[PDB]
Subunit: 320 residues, 4 copies
Amino acid sequence: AALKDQLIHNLLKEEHVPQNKITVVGVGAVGMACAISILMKDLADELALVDVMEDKLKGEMMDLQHGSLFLRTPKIVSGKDYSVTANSKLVIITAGAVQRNVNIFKFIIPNVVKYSPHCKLLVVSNPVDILTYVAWKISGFPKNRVIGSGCNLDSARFRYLMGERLGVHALSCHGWILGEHGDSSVPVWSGMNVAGVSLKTLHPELGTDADKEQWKQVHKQVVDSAYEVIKLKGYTSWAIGLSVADLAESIMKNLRRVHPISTMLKGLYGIKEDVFLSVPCVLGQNGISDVVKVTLTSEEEAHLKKSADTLWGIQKELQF
Amino acid sequence: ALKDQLIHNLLHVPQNKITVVGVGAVGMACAISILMKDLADELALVDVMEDKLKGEMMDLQHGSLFLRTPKIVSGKDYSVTANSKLVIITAGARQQEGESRLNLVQRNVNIFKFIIPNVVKYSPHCKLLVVSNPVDILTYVAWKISGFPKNRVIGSGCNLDSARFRYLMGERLGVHALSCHGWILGEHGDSSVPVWSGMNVAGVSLKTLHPELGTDADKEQWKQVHKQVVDSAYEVIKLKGYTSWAIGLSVADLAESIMKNLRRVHPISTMLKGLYGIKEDVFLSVPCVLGQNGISDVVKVTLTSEEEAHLKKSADTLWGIQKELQF
Amino acid sequence: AALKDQLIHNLLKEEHVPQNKITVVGVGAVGMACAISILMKDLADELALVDVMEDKLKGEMMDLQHGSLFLRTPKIVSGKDYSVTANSKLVIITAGANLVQRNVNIFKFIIPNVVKYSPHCKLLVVSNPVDILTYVAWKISGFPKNRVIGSGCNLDSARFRYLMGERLGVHALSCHGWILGEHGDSSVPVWSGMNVAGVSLKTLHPELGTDADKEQWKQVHKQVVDSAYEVIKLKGYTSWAIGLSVADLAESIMKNLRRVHPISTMLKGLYGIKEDVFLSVPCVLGQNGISDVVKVTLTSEEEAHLKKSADTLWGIQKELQF
Amino acid sequence: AALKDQLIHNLLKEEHVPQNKITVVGVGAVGMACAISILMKDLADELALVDVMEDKLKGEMMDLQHGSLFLRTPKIVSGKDYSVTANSKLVIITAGARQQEGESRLNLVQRNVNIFKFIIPNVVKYSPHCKLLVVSNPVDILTYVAWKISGFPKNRVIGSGCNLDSARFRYLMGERLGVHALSCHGWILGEHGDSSVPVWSGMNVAGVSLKTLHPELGTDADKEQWKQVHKQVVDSAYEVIKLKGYTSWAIGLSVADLAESIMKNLRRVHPISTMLKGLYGIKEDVFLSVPCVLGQNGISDVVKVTLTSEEEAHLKKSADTLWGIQKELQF
């Protein structure tokens, strides 16, 4: 008969629903950077890629499949039809162009929610705070399961810059950027430390214009990292990729590690409208379970409630 | 200074350094795969295109929290690649419309005349891994220019081919590529040789169990599996405009064997004057032992009369272009 | 207010139902080598340890929990009570004491407890003798055969590949060879399938695996047979190699890789065997356990050695009382 | 013809000089947990085990060899003779005198010195450029012993020190706050075990000082008993020892973490035992755990933790104890 029947005796009926499936929505350079990083970390037993361009979608899929000998993710599937994204534990949304973006998500999210009703939603698209609200509003998901990339990578970048100055690895440099991704993010100088030693105690001018070492510019460097990498190679892909696989690892492995990620905050940090900002969140198999209450100066508190107003303003005028 | 109030100093030649030459989609696929397997305590990128380079380096630098490669450096000047144990060549020129095979190789030779001498001066004990196509010739080119011994110049050759073969073999048998064994040897491209005899799952010859395997008669058209591999790049470039991921994984796989001195057997491009009836200085892919000193040993596959003939004709063709190169 | 409620705002009461749980039964040297190998390969979100010696159990559990900072397995539980093993994807049996009958007595308690708390789990038997006691767990459990696996010749083949690699000067990864049938004195070295890069060493060297071979390759399978015995007479027991080889099966199962392992499956109706026995053949291991068996072409001497193993096993299993 | 000669054509006469070699001295339960965790993190191209029990050593070596298929460390060797350890980058010392019943603390220390008199010069002979990582207890004392006998500069002698005490402490923090230990920070410093100094000021999640949220944290009043969390660490070993007779897994994991920082040149901050004469107001040649920057050259820099006048007393107290004990030792 067929070679396969000569070689192999089948004694079971492929009753296969995947146990540890990640979907990456959108195969721009960000999405494919999240894909390659997720694949190389052995996080998922099935990876699904979905996008509007059928040729490019298939290209990426085929390429990843060609690497199957060097990976430990046995099934990699793609399609325009969101049926391929079914029984995903985690769906990473990386697609967009703002009201237009909403309208993009009104196709994506009802489809993601149909086929993976119990999934976690990781929104990476910009503007990430509003698009995490849109993802949440449209999905009907409880806030624990709608997560925004937020300032996760901004904090990773901050810790790198801290690292190169102090001449120690980023893993041993602790620092938090919170609130609205980009220009309005608050660098929490009180929390910055190495081996638990407050850098604000040793250098009290830390976080002021007057400061000789200009540590305030290290936060300027963070918000202007994306623009400076886009000016040089046309986009960013690798850092966001490794950061999103970090969030994915905490979720799939249920690690309950603390990440500065965008969460539905109303009722905390003095914020009394439905918005999403970065605060340190305990991340595990049911998404965001718990938020750390960071002690903020009244200036840091004001700055966070200003951001919340800016977001509620824009969010009020969006049509659903 | 904060650095000095917080840290007391009490006390820089890198021991496990890799350079990727060229920050095309390939070299970056190689770079991320290397970082994400912790093969290197230092990564250097080099490319003629200055902005893109800085930009790419910076994009990896920002991922440092999530890595265990503590130093990422770039530059157009090759001083940044000093004391690399492995140097991976991905920079080249793509074939233009109407361009002959000799004119393409020649153009790349002119590029390698700048790249290679610069690599040897700052890293004179490194192994060279040439990915740049056409890889069998461009590996010869890098060998002759470097003046390195042969053990230390390696082409990626039929590594990715054999990998895509083991994938396709596994989608057909319903087992993982890791459990499907098959070797594509000789010249990378349409002249690839698929060694049907050595194809096994669990050490069971699929050629003994199904003698049609490889022939036109075969009702399962296994000959079109060797064609699917030949046409893999074609099919991916048609859909997404280039290939990146798979070659990366493949190169990082060779990097591991070298950096960690595994002495694993890979199908890769070595100078095999004096083996498989080849009498001149050419690079064909045969199963090579890959360790910290590069290619140290070669497995001798029993080939059919047909198969050692395919390798002689490729060796005749490669020499035919090679003798006509102005170095 | 309590520091915890000062630092952390609870957003979600959550049900604690584990998603990728592994149980190791027995915390002897073998079971803890399995535990540490599984922990360091990141195959589980929860590891349970069960054994009769509550002190040993709690100590081993605490010693692992103290490494949590260095691991990505966020929950390690332990107990005499099999309640801790609830909702294991995979339960690995390392516990055991007519010597056969005493391991059956033990299995008649252990296996029903595993089944009560994990009706849907795969069973990976390791205790010796492993082909018989896989059979015992299959009979006692009432599980389908695809979900009852024995570690079988997975380690023998690995040792064989290391030994092969030392004589050729290549890594064991690039040395292929299969040891099949009964684990131990009666294991079958399949000379035909021994290869580097698809070159049949038996074709290359026809005297390979026969008495009149000056390279003495038949004495290399006797090293694999004798390996345990020699390491036991040197350090008291074997642990590291079995532990790594068991994690390897764990990885295939938990990641659904569908790789081929020489593991012990219920073989009635394959390889000319007509009784209910477990023997090692190349098995496709995935998330539903053994989905498929590779039909290996055997010499008549090999077919016979296997059928003879099936008779001595079935004969030992006839005399057992469940 | 020979099967090797038929199959494989040699192109390159190969003399192995290893580039990433780690030696573990002592194949007690601790040596072997260091060995397996090092092997399973792919940190060495060669591993060498060494001990005095010839049977035990060869047997362990083989068990590891027999799982080479599941590893990425091609060369695993062993021997009584220390020549097997040449060209190690890192020699982890886990060996020590066996406890005789009815023996003084001092006679025990002094038997461990006589053992290090045999071990250390044999290590330095064959691997003269290696970093030493001393694990054997007492760890602060024997790290000094190893520094003095070796005559290596302080940057290349590390003690395991309070590294695992900190990791134990972070596990315990984790269980109380219901967060992973990676996300709970606290440092245990000074002398390893009973005299360990817990640095309350430094303890946090997400850079939020726990001492600030809860000012009684550390004091005896504090009704949440956080001081008992420090005693839980000091005592952790003692309780694991009563239950299973020894500790092996945690220290193995924690030693491997230090090896990684050395072998990958990470420059990560670890609470390890360094020779701190000149730092922290310490005036004599003793080893105490401070947050050290660990890399290919060993300990390169030390972080200067702002200590309370009390915590500063405890360190000095430990430095007099240690200097006191070291004076009475026969080198």
